[PDB]
Amino acid sequence: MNLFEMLRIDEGLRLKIYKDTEGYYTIGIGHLLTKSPSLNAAKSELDKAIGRNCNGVITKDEAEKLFNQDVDAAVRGILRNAKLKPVYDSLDAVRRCALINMVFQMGETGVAGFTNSLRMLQQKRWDEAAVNLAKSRWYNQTPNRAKRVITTFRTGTWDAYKNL
Numbered sequence: 261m262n263l264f265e266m267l268r269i270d271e272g273l274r275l276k277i278y279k280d281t282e283g284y285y286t287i288g289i290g291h292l293l294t295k296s297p298s299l300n301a302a303k304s305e306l307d308k309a310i311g312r313n314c315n316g317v318i319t320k321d322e323a324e325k326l327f328n329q330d331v332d333a334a335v336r337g338i339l340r341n342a343k344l345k346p347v348y349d350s351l352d353a354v355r356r357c358a359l360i361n362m363v364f365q366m367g368e369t370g371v372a373g374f375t376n377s378l379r380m381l382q383q384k385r386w387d388e389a390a391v392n393l394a395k396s397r398w399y400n401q402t403p404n405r406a407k408r409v410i411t412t413f414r415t416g417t418w419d420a421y422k423n424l
Contacts, residue, residue: 350382
């Protein structure tokens with residue numbers, strides 16, 4: 261299993277422009293196009309991003325490539341962060357995915373503000389962390405996704421994704 265699928269399942273893959281939760285213009289696995297409230301702008305940004313006139317629609321291979329870009333970017337902010345870096349540094353691969361899943365879900369800042377839980381993860385206090393994370397607004401917002409992610413922190417496996 262990979263990040264791709266994990267995210268593919270938690271965030272979802274869109275092949276045509278759409279309005280994220282909050283309202284901006286996004287595509288594929290939650291790729292923000294623009295903040296601007298103009299479709300035309302979105303289009304144009306997609307086109308730049310993709311390298312072809314897309315007309316608001318991409319192929320999956322396309323969404324994948326965007327995605328793998330969005331990842332390494334996420335990772336960089338991660339590794340250029342005071343709080344996240346050490347934690348991440350110290351996580352195992354499957355466990356890193358979960359952090360990344362998180363970063364994607366709420367951005368580098370949001371994640372970096374879970375002082376305690378981050379601490380635990382860093383400490384390798386899986387259950388503690390999990391229970392901790394189980395009480396964030398986050399968890400309450402997106403329970404399913406949250407439970408999956410949290411379970412992964414705890415278990416350190418993809419098990420939570422195996423039979424969906």
